[PDB]
Structure 1
């Protein structure tokens, strides 16, 4: 070792040459996955190629709680609120997740509205052609039925907007930094304050 260089820490002391993974098959993998997707689309025709509907869920942890993404499946509470029996939802293209809990009204209401939109946009063929049942669609709707290729219900964020508002005296007399400092102090000293209150 010589000169002023960063201290090296290369992890190459084992038989690493026997565990090298190359990517010469990357185009082949892409082609194989595309072929599988095409075969699946042909198989499930006329069902949408994007797959079953998924719920809207929040991101985990403080880093992503402002983000909205797709969850595994709709909760039992959401299905009950939307009037869709849980045993029927999977058969009509709705994913079901019996594990997800509903802690707030906003998420439950959002997913219920999503399910209602899907129901409004859903067309169901009868099990037997000559027999029409409660959940089946009319012949006119069935005739104009096609396979949807892309995502039929994109999960998108409401883009930010900067509006002009009046600055009132109440806002001009608010000490944000002082509020933050006092809240931090209260959080730090809650235990001591409770102990003193209990003692006295």
Structure 2
């Protein structure tokens, strides 16, 4: 699953971004990606983090939006394509993307 851009702690490393554990509830809500469903579609959720800066919040929204742009989801059944799924012709060209498909 996906991970947030966050800052490191600790004066020695405050200036270096790195991967986090999950997007806060506030990002998942403001991106149109429900709490219960983000782990379902491969987005971690971290109930414990706090966002104190618009810069961090908008950066993590940008990661969410990009991921939801380049995410494809197969239907739960064969012919029944419901909301959130994707077109057959879209599904037919999906492969297993390997390595870090979003480098921080």
1:123 is aligned to 2:59? no
How many Å separate the matches in 2 of 1:113 and 1:80?
13
Higher RCO structure, 1 or 2 (CA under 8 Å, sep 6+): 2
Cα shift at 1:146: 0.3
Unaligned runs of 5+ in 1: 1-51, 156-200
1:111 is aligned to 2:52? no
1:134-153 equivalent positions in 2, closer than 5 A: 134-153=83-102
Name the counterpart of 1:88: 37
1:1-200 equivalent positions in 2, closer than 5 A: 52-155=1-104
Instruction: Output the TM-score relative to the length of structure 2.
Output: 0.98
Instruction: Output the TM-score relative to the length of structure 1.
Output: 0.52
Relative to its length, the structure with more helix (as a share) is: 1
Q: How many residues align?
A: 104
Larger radius of gyration: 1
